[PDB]
Amino acid sequence: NAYRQSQSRAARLRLLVDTGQELIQLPPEAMRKCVLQRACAFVAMDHGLLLEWGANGVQTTARHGSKERLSTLADPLAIGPQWLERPGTHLPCVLLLPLRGADEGSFGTLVLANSVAISAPDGEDIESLQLLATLLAAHLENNRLLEALV
Amino acid sequence: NAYRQSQSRAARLRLLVDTGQELIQLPPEAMRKCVLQRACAFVAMDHGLLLEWGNGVQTTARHGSKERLSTLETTADPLAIGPQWLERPGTHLPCVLLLPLRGADEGSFGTLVLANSVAISAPDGEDIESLQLLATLLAAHLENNRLLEALVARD
Amino acid sequence: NAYRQSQSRAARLRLLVDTGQELIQLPPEAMRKCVLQRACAFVAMDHGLLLEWGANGVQTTARHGSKERLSTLADPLAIGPQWLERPGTHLPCVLLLPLRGADEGSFGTLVLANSVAISAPDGEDIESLQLLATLLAAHLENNRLLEALV
Amino acid sequence: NAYRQSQSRAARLRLLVDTGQELIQLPPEAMRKCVLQRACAFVAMDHGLLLEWGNGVQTTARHGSKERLSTLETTADPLAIGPQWLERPGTHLPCVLLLPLRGADEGSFGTLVLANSVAISAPDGEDIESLQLLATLLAAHLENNRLLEALVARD
């Protein structure tokens, strides 16, 4: 269907351009919250987390949606996206997007989660979210390097 | 197509110059309705509202059925820079465009919210950019009014 | 000529959208400098000033190009644009764009000036610059009201 | 036209996803040439350069005749937010598009400068927005490299 493809392509492009222009203007805490919110909204998922480690110990640096439900839910060796179905739980569907930096594996992960079972985002939507995750990862790392130099 | 793009660009300029000129002339309630109505028409989106916050979020203008408009979340979004296109499949308003209002003061103090009853592709980027500027023009004028009112309240 | 019109319309639209999105993100001093620079570049004029008064006495709050040449050059009752030819001078052509606020007349003016005689910008270019001047004027006034409330 | 806009949007996405993927793989000099070449091709602009500053402004990549490129001003523009389209009638490069580079650090530290030897209309807004994001992707990666180099220099 060309209309659904048409819609698909536009939504992806707007996500990238809109999130990118905002991300580079915001201070670190706001940035992480806002990228997470925009990522979640793109796939219509009602919860999310940004997790970061190795600054080993996992820290939640942004959250979207119920903290109780999100507590009901970190692989530093992961590099690829993963869609998890979790039948009969409070967050039945979860998308994991590893944040990759200077070392092997990942130093964090974007976690997008939904309170209702839903379809996995399609391959092309994941590819766009991965591009965005690369930009976020670079800014997370750069902010850490900036602080190390200070 | 060169001709079509030139003609679309003329339409964007008319929207901006004509509405920007008129905002100067109008009282705040009239400004809000004018911008919302014109913005909705410009991109053929059949619903819209304007949200403003400082108590809490207030809906200051509406276009289209109040019933469907009620289904939209109305959260303050002071951090927002630039637009957001949202797909909300299966809902009463499956497509939504957010255009923040930001003046001279720190933070966005409102959002122009356009919405459509059926799934459509996001409007052309330069339509979106024009609507974002129209929101910015509205914001400057609404903020001016607020600030002058606040200053007269101060005595 | 449809191509020159095509070019004309695009340049005007980009000016408005680009200047507007930047203006609302910048602190007051930067804002005034950047709107002036963008205005000047739009009409390919190599000098400019932003003048403000009534905070009566005229203050230069942004400048573009040679301060010496600009010294070689304020009506608070003016409201319309004006193109001045000044034959045999250091700045042979000048565009004045009054900044209108809460009172009759203007509280400032954008001055765009060129070191070489050139054609006046066309009516449509002036109309776009006037729209931009209205946005700038509102922000100048709002910044003053903000300070008055503080 | 719906079909044409969908196809243009596919081309913008390819540019972004494909180039963004490749930036990860490449050394800094290669990153700069790749983005400049692809950006110029994408909007059919026959010249370009990349400017970066911290001594002073340095031209770090070029595309097209160095002779015509020399005619462009090379001033640091740390305050710039978003693009700028310039008409420079009668010059060697009568049309110029500026796309700032901004990372995590305060201020823009460079500009992608695209330019054309003949007057053309500004590219479509969503082409411009895509090129601006490509500059942003480049910036993040160039800044990362700079910062890691600065940190190894620190011992």
Side-chain angles (χ1 to χ4, degrees), chain D residues 107-129:
Chain D
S108 173
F109 65 86
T111 326
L112 186 60
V113 181
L114 313 186
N116 203 55
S117 60
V118 295
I120 54 169
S121 294
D124 292 354
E126 222 173 47
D127 286 348
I128 293 176
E129 288 186 286

PDB file of all heavy atoms in Angstrom, chain D residues 107-129:
ATOM      1  N   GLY D 107      28.088  25.991  21.674  1.00  0.00           N
ATOM      2  CA  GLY D 107      28.399  26.693  20.457  1.00  0.00           C
ATOM      3  C   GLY D 107      28.518  25.789  19.242  1.00  0.00           C
ATOM      4  O   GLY D 107      28.870  24.597  19.365  1.00  0.00           O
ATOM      5  N   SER D 108      28.260  26.359  18.074  1.00  0.00           N
ATOM      6  CA  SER D 108      28.590  25.674  16.817  1.00  0.00           C
ATOM      7  C   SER D 108      30.102  25.761  16.640  1.00  0.00           C
ATOM      8  O   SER D 108      30.672  26.845  16.842  1.00  0.00           O
ATOM      9  CB  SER D 108      27.877  26.352  15.655  1.00  0.00           C
ATOM     10  OG  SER D 108      28.304  25.819  14.401  1.00  0.00           O
ATOM     11  N   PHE D 109      30.736  24.665  16.235  1.00  0.00           N
ATOM     12  CA  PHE D 109      32.177  24.616  15.959  1.00  0.00           C
ATOM     13  C   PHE D 109      32.534  24.488  14.478  1.00  0.00           C
ATOM     14  O   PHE D 109      33.686  24.262  14.121  1.00  0.00           O
ATOM     15  CB  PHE D 109      32.820  23.477  16.746  1.00  0.00           C
ATOM     16  CG  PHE D 109      32.369  22.088  16.339  1.00  0.00           C
ATOM     17  CD1 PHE D 109      32.973  21.418  15.296  1.00  0.00           C
ATOM     18  CD2 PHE D 109      31.381  21.436  17.049  1.00  0.00           C
ATOM     19  CE1 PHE D 109      32.587  20.100  14.966  1.00  0.00           C
ATOM     20  CE2 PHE D 109      30.993  20.132  16.727  1.00  0.00           C
ATOM     21  CZ  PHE D 109      31.568  19.486  15.667  1.00  0.00           C
ATOM     22  N   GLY D 110      31.555  24.611  13.603  1.00  0.00           N
ATOM     23  CA  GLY D 110      31.835  24.556  12.183  1.00  0.00           C
ATOM     24  C   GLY D 110      30.578  24.744  11.384  1.00  0.00           C
ATOM     25  O   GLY D 110      29.497  24.900  11.961  1.00  0.00           O
ATOM     26  N   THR D 111      30.744  24.778  10.065  1.00  0.00           N
ATOM     27  CA  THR D 111      29.652  24.937   9.120  1.00  0.00           C
ATOM     28  C   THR D 111      29.941  24.130   7.892  1.00  0.00           C
ATOM     29  O   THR D 111      31.048  24.211   7.347  1.00  0.00           O
ATOM     30  CB  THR D 111      29.470  26.381   8.578  1.00  0.00           C
ATOM     31  OG1 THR D 111      29.812  27.316   9.591  1.00  0.00           O
ATOM     32  CG2 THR D 111      28.048  26.528   8.159  1.00  0.00           C
ATOM     33  N   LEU D 112      28.951  23.357   7.461  1.00  0.00           N
ATOM     34  CA  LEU D 112      28.971  22.765   6.143  1.00  0.00           C
ATOM     35  C   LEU D 112      28.447  23.831   5.180  1.00  0.00           C
ATOM     36  O   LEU D 112      27.361  24.398   5.406  1.00  0.00           O
ATOM     37  CB  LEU D 112      28.118  21.479   6.169  1.00  0.00           C
ATOM     38  CG  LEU D 112      28.062  20.563   4.962  1.00  0.00           C
ATOM     39  CD1 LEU D 112      29.466  20.062   4.642  1.00  0.00           C
ATOM     40  CD2 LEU D 112      27.049  19.368   5.227  1.00  0.00           C
ATOM     41  N   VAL D 113      29.221  24.143   4.144  1.00  0.00           N
ATOM     42  CA  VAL D 113      28.921  25.224   3.236  1.00  0.00           C
ATOM     43  C   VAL D 113      28.738  24.584   1.867  1.00  0.00           C
ATOM     44  O   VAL D 113      29.684  24.014   1.313  1.00  0.00           O
ATOM     45  CB  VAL D 113      30.048  26.290   3.178  1.00  0.00           C
ATOM     46  CG1 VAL D 113      29.673  27.488   2.180  1.00  0.00           C
ATOM     47  CG2 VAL D 113      30.387  26.885   4.576  1.00  0.00           C
ATOM     48  N   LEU D 114      27.520  24.618   1.342  1.00  0.00           N
ATOM     49  CA  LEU D 114      27.264  24.165  -0.015  1.00  0.00           C
ATOM     50  C   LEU D 114      27.065  25.403  -0.864  1.00  0.00           C
ATOM     51  O   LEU D 114      26.511  26.413  -0.402  1.00  0.00           O
ATOM     52  CB  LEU D 114      26.004  23.288  -0.071  1.00  0.00           C
ATOM     53  CG  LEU D 114      25.885  22.184   0.994  1.00  0.00           C
ATOM     54  CD1 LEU D 114      24.614  21.292   0.705  1.00  0.00           C
ATOM     55  CD2 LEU D 114      27.138  21.382   1.093  1.00  0.00           C
ATOM     56  N   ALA D 115      27.503  25.350  -2.119  1.00  0.00           N
ATOM     57  CA  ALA D 115      27.453  26.525  -2.968  1.00  0.00           C
ATOM     58  C   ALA D 115      27.277  26.110  -4.402  1.00  0.00           C
ATOM     59  O   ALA D 115      27.671  25.012  -4.766  1.00  0.00           O
ATOM     60  CB  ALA D 115      28.736  27.359  -2.818  1.00  0.00           C
ATOM     61  N   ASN D 116      26.702  26.974  -5.225  1.00  0.00           N
ATOM     62  CA  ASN D 116      26.498  26.642  -6.623  1.00  0.00           C
ATOM     63  C   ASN D 116      27.016  27.761  -7.527  1.00  0.00           C
ATOM     64  O   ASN D 116      26.911  28.944  -7.194  1.00  0.00           O
ATOM     65  CB  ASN D 116      25.019  26.353  -6.885  1.00  0.00           C
ATOM     66  CG  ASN D 116      24.803  25.494  -8.113  1.00  0.00           C
ATOM     67  OD1 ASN D 116      25.373  24.387  -8.212  1.00  0.00           O
ATOM     68  ND2 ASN D 116      24.031  26.023  -9.109  1.00  0.00           N
ATOM     69  N   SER D 117      27.564  27.372  -8.684  1.00  0.00           N
ATOM     70  CA  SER D 117      28.134  28.316  -9.629  1.00  0.00           C
ATOM     71  C   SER D 117      27.109  29.147 -10.375  1.00  0.00           C
ATOM     72  O   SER D 117      27.469  30.166 -10.947  1.00  0.00           O
ATOM     73  CB  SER D 117      28.996  27.568 -10.648  1.00  0.00           C
ATOM     74  OG  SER D 117      28.205  26.632 -11.363  1.00  0.00           O
ATOM     75  N   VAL D 118      25.850  28.716 -10.385  1.00  0.00           N
ATOM     76  CA  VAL D 118      24.786  29.471 -11.017  1.00  0.00           C
ATOM     77  C   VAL D 118      23.583  29.607 -10.061  1.00  0.00           C
ATOM     78  O   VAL D 118      23.372  28.781  -9.155  1.00  0.00           O
ATOM     79  CB  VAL D 118      24.339  28.883 -12.386  1.00  0.00           C
ATOM     80  CG1 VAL D 118      25.469  28.973 -13.441  1.00  0.00           C
ATOM     81  CG2 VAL D 118      23.859  27.494 -12.245  1.00  0.00           C
ATOM     82  N   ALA D 119      22.835  30.685 -10.238  1.00  0.00           N
ATOM     83  CA  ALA D 119      21.642  30.942  -9.411  1.00  0.00           C
ATOM     84  C   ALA D 119      20.631  29.805  -9.587  1.00  0.00           C
ATOM     85  O   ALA D 119      20.273  29.428 -10.719  1.00  0.00           O
ATOM     86  CB  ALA D 119      21.021  32.296  -9.776  1.00  0.00           C
ATOM     87  N   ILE D 120      20.197  29.228  -8.469  1.00  0.00           N
ATOM     88  CA  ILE D 120      19.149  28.208  -8.454  1.00  0.00           C
ATOM     89  C   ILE D 120      18.182  28.580  -7.321  1.00  0.00           C
ATOM     90  O   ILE D 120      18.516  29.402  -6.472  1.00  0.00           O
ATOM     91  CB  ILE D 120      19.698  26.783  -8.198  1.00  0.00           C
ATOM     92  CG1 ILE D 120      20.553  26.709  -6.925  1.00  0.00           C
ATOM     93  CG2 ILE D 120      20.512  26.288  -9.413  1.00  0.00           C
ATOM     94  CD1 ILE D 120      20.892  25.296  -6.505  1.00  0.00           C
ATOM     95  N   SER D 121      17.003  27.990  -7.296  1.00  0.00           N
ATOM     96  CA  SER D 121      16.090  28.202  -6.154  1.00  0.00           C
ATOM     97  C   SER D 121      16.638  27.422  -4.968  1.00  0.00           C
ATOM     98  O   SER D 121      17.307  26.399  -5.144  1.00  0.00           O
ATOM     99  CB  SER D 121      14.699  27.723  -6.488  1.00  0.00           C
ATOM    100  OG  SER D 121      14.138  28.506  -7.501  1.00  0.00           O
ATOM    101  N   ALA D 122      16.391  27.889  -3.751  1.00  0.00           N
ATOM    102  CA  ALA D 122      16.769  27.104  -2.593  1.00  0.00           C
ATOM    103  C   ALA D 122      16.204  25.691  -2.742  1.00  0.00           C
ATOM    104  O   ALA D 122      15.075  25.525  -3.207  1.00  0.00           O
ATOM    105  CB  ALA D 122      16.253  27.760  -1.270  1.00  0.00           C
ATOM    106  N   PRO D 123      16.961  24.672  -2.299  1.00  0.00           N
ATOM    107  CA  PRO D 123      16.411  23.339  -2.295  1.00  0.00           C
ATOM    108  C   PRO D 123      15.115  23.224  -1.478  1.00  0.00           C
ATOM    109  O   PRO D 123      14.830  24.048  -0.580  1.00  0.00           O
ATOM    110  CB  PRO D 123      17.529  22.507  -1.653  1.00  0.00           C
ATOM    111  CG  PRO D 123      18.800  23.268  -1.970  1.00  0.00           C
ATOM    112  CD  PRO D 123      18.383  24.690  -1.902  1.00  0.00           C
ATOM    113  N   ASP D 124      14.348  22.193  -1.782  1.00  0.00           N
ATOM    114  CA  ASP D 124      13.123  21.943  -1.056  1.00  0.00           C
ATOM    115  C   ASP D 124      13.416  21.907   0.444  1.00  0.00           C
ATOM    116  O   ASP D 124      14.455  21.397   0.872  1.00  0.00           O
ATOM    117  CB  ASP D 124      12.529  20.625  -1.537  1.00  0.00           C
ATOM    118  CG  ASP D 124      12.022  20.699  -2.990  1.00  0.00           C
ATOM    119  OD1 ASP D 124      12.021  21.799  -3.607  1.00  0.00           O
ATOM    120  OD2 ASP D 124      11.605  19.637  -3.505  1.00  0.00           O
ATOM    121  N   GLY D 125      12.513  22.446   1.247  1.00  0.00           N
ATOM    122  CA  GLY D 125      12.731  22.544   2.675  1.00  0.00           C
ATOM    123  C   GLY D 125      13.125  21.238   3.332  1.00  0.00           C
ATOM    124  O   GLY D 125      13.988  21.224   4.215  1.00  0.00           O
ATOM    125  N   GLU D 126      12.529  20.129   2.910  1.00  0.00           N
ATOM    126  CA  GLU D 126      12.850  18.877   3.578  1.00  0.00           C
ATOM    127  C   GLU D 126      14.193  18.261   3.114  1.00  0.00           C
ATOM    128  O   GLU D 126      14.778  17.430   3.820  1.00  0.00           O
ATOM    129  CB  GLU D 126      11.705  17.894   3.454  1.00  0.00           C
ATOM    130  CG  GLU D 126      11.482  17.183   4.713  1.00  0.00           C
ATOM    131  CD  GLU D 126      10.274  16.336   4.668  1.00  0.00           C
ATOM    132  OE1 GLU D 126      10.084  15.595   3.673  1.00  0.00           O
ATOM    133  OE2 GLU D 126       9.518  16.441   5.649  1.00  0.00           O
ATOM    134  N   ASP D 127      14.666  18.654   1.936  1.00  0.00           N
ATOM    135  CA  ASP D 127      16.061  18.419   1.568  1.00  0.00           C
ATOM    136  C   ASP D 127      16.988  19.193   2.496  1.00  0.00           C
ATOM    137  O   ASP D 127      17.970  18.656   2.979  1.00  0.00           O
ATOM    138  CB  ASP D 127      16.354  18.793   0.102  1.00  0.00           C
ATOM    139  CG  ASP D 127      15.793  17.814  -0.897  1.00  0.00           C
ATOM    140  OD1 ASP D 127      15.364  16.705  -0.502  1.00  0.00           O
ATOM    141  OD2 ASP D 127      15.843  18.143  -2.092  1.00  0.00           O
ATOM    142  N   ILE D 128      16.677  20.468   2.726  1.00  0.00           N
ATOM    143  CA  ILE D 128      17.461  21.293   3.626  1.00  0.00           C
ATOM    144  C   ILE D 128      17.491  20.731   5.047  1.00  0.00           C
ATOM    145  O   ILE D 128      18.566  20.603   5.635  1.00  0.00           O
ATOM    146  CB  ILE D 128      16.969  22.750   3.632  1.00  0.00           C
ATOM    147  CG1 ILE D 128      17.237  23.397   2.266  1.00  0.00           C
ATOM    148  CG2 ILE D 128      17.713  23.555   4.771  1.00  0.00           C
ATOM    149  CD1 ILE D 128      16.697  24.821   2.114  1.00  0.00           C
ATOM    150  N   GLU D 129      16.322  20.332   5.561  1.00  0.00           N
ATOM    151  CA  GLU D 129      16.240  19.710   6.871  1.00  0.00           C
ATOM    152  C   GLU D 129      17.049  18.405   6.986  1.00  0.00           C
ATOM    153  O   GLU D 129      17.665  18.154   8.004  1.00  0.00           O
ATOM    154  CB  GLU D 129      14.784  19.401   7.225  1.00  0.00           C
ATOM    155  CG  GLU D 129      13.928  20.564   7.541  1.00  0.00           C
ATOM    156  CD  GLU D 129      12.536  20.079   8.033  1.00  0.00           C
ATOM    157  OE1 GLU D 129      11.746  19.627   7.233  1.00  0.00           O
ATOM    158  OE2 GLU D 129      12.272  20.158   9.223  1.00  0.00           O
TER     159      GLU D 129
END
